[model samples]
Target: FNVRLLTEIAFMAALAFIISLIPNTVYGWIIVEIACIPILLLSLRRGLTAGLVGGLIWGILSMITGHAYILSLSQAFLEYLVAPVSLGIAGLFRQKTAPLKLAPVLLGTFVAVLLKYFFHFIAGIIFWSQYAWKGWGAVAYSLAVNGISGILTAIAAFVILIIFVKKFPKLFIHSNY
Candidate 1:
């Protein structure tokens, strides 16, 4: 990557990390994280590599900030590494034009967040089974928890993307085909 690209990625990763630090409690209970906004923007604008790099940095930052819950090496990798990197998968749906449409971005955000949640789900099942709800199995509990965060974050990310794409098309659109 060029110096400019690297700089932008680092900036966005830093932004994402900062955003992750702010806690928003929704429904009077569940805490939602909207840090994916920057990650999605970089991914859609610069492609997968940029997105992945930014996401990786965000993950590392989150880990260092004591946000990560680790039980085993594999679980740590799954939740703290793979899950964050998965958000960049949205770059696969990046559009190559100005005044981008919503369909691709919506699909990309949901898919990316879902993929991220899948990793968390795996970690929950493998290492967090002990915390499962009394009446629920590991799979269901994992799904319930991760699914809420994933879907909420995806929706928030998409709404934020729409505003950003509308106001600054150049920042969200991938000019190179």
Candidate 2:
């Protein structure tokens, strides 16, 4: 059982890393990345520990790739480390079927994406505030960017999770192996 769990964690972590590497970058900081999908999926399916470990693995990879160095080390911890692992918050939700399965997914999607956005929003306030223009303060810009990204990502992840859970109930429901 322990070996099985370890193997699953490794596979999920690897998948998370690969997915993150396939990004839709628009500029210096914004990227339409789906790395959160697998992490949240695992959290929603397995549990918080599984999801968090997978997210932490993804964080390490992000740091190695220089993606997490946009700000100070402290900011990196909040943005890359805590933000991705925040998806584990999804595991805190109830995982059920019929009336409440998608419920957890929907809730988890918002919880996870918003958590990530929270970190990015903070970073923007502290580090990118100087980029503010006209009457728009850093906080406002951060609010819009992070808020929009979080909502959009939540929607995308929610849809994918429903399709996956419905299609592959067996793989996720349980495993005797």
Candidate 3:
């Protein structure tokens, strides 16, 4: 792998991981945190491989730090692995221009955040269903939890992306100067 690519991934992953550790809201079974900002930025800027690698590394760190719930291998794979890596899909919407387009930024954040929680929603349905409240089926519970957190995270990411894109558009550019 290229040194710059790996380094960038490592830096972003570490930043996301550390930030994830600090501030979070525990929603009975899940912890909602603002960790996707860096991954979103990296993915949109560096493209798929970089975003995937960075998110993978961040997921590994989450596991190593005991932040993950390991009910089953498949569940862990979905919640920890697939969930984070899904954020990298935003790379597919990477803006080609240096100025950064708003549509891609908006759509990228939406899709990325949606995927991140979608996998968690699946895992919650399969593995964490027993934790559902009375009269709340697994599907409804997962919808509530993941939906609320996903919407919050999406709004946060979108705001941060807008601010960064407006103030530091250069950050999204891969310059050859």
Candidate 4:
């Protein structure tokens, strides 16, 4: 990799790790322990490879830092690893005109967010099977909790990304590529 690429990766990984330290919440039930803005932003600025590396570092660090549940290692892996890697899909639409048109960014963000939820949902099913019992209101509760929280978070994150791109073009633009 070139110096510029390495620099970008380091910057993005640091940003992801730092932002993850902040704690937030969603609907009192679900916690938004980490802010993934840096990950998504990096994916938008860089390509898939850079995004994946950044995400991988972030995932490993998060697991090590106790941000994830160790009881469900698979679920934790899915959350930190698979979900962030999926966000790299945003790199596929990192062109100027694409963001100007707003189609690719929106679609890419949607897919990334969907993949995140998918992994988490699957994790819930596998680790928390009790939540899937029929007539127990478990599945419904899980869906309601995770779905609503994920949707709100995704929408908010997407809006924040749009604003950031508009306000700071330099941060979102990658000239070295």
Best by lDDT: 3
List, residue by residue over 1-177, the lDDT tens digit for candidate 2.
478777877787778888877765654455555778878777776788887888898898878876555567787888888888878887776364433355666777778788888888887888777776568988997777676677767777877877876887554443453
lDDT of 3 by residue, 1-177 (tens): 567777888999999988887767767755555799999989988898889888999999999889777988888788788899889999998876755678888898899999899888888788988989999999999988888889888888888889988888877765545
* Regions of model 2 farther than 4 Å from truth: 26-30, 94-100
Candidate 4 residue pairs in backbone clash: none
lDDT of 4 by residue, 1-177 (tens): 788888878777777778867666755446552366677778877777788788788888878887765556666777778876766777776764333545666777777766777676666656665645466465665676567767876787778777865777666667744
lDDT of 3 at 65: 88
Q: Candidate 1 residues 1-177, lDDT tens each?
A: 577789889999999889987876674324476887889888988888888888999989988888766787888788778888888898898887655787887888888888988887787788887887689999998888777877888778878888876787777764433
> Considering only N, C-alpha and C atoms within 3 Å, which residue pairs clash in candidate 2?
none
User: Would you list the clashing residue pairs of candidate 3?
Assistant: none
Q: How much lDDT does each candidate structure score?
A: 0.82, 0.74, 0.85, 0.70
Supply candidate 4's per-residue lDDT for 129: 54
TM-score (C-alpha) between model 2 and the true structure: 0.86
Model 4 residue 94 CA deviation (Å) reads: 1.2
Q: Best candidate per TM-score, number?
A: 3
Superposed on all Cα atoms, the candidates' RMSDs to the truth, in angstroms, are 2.4, 2.4, 1.5, 2.9
Q: Sort by lDDT, best first: what order?
A: 3, 1, 2, 4
Quickly count the clashes in candidate 3. Answer: 0
Name the weakest run of 10 consecutive residues (lDDT summed) in model 1: 24-33
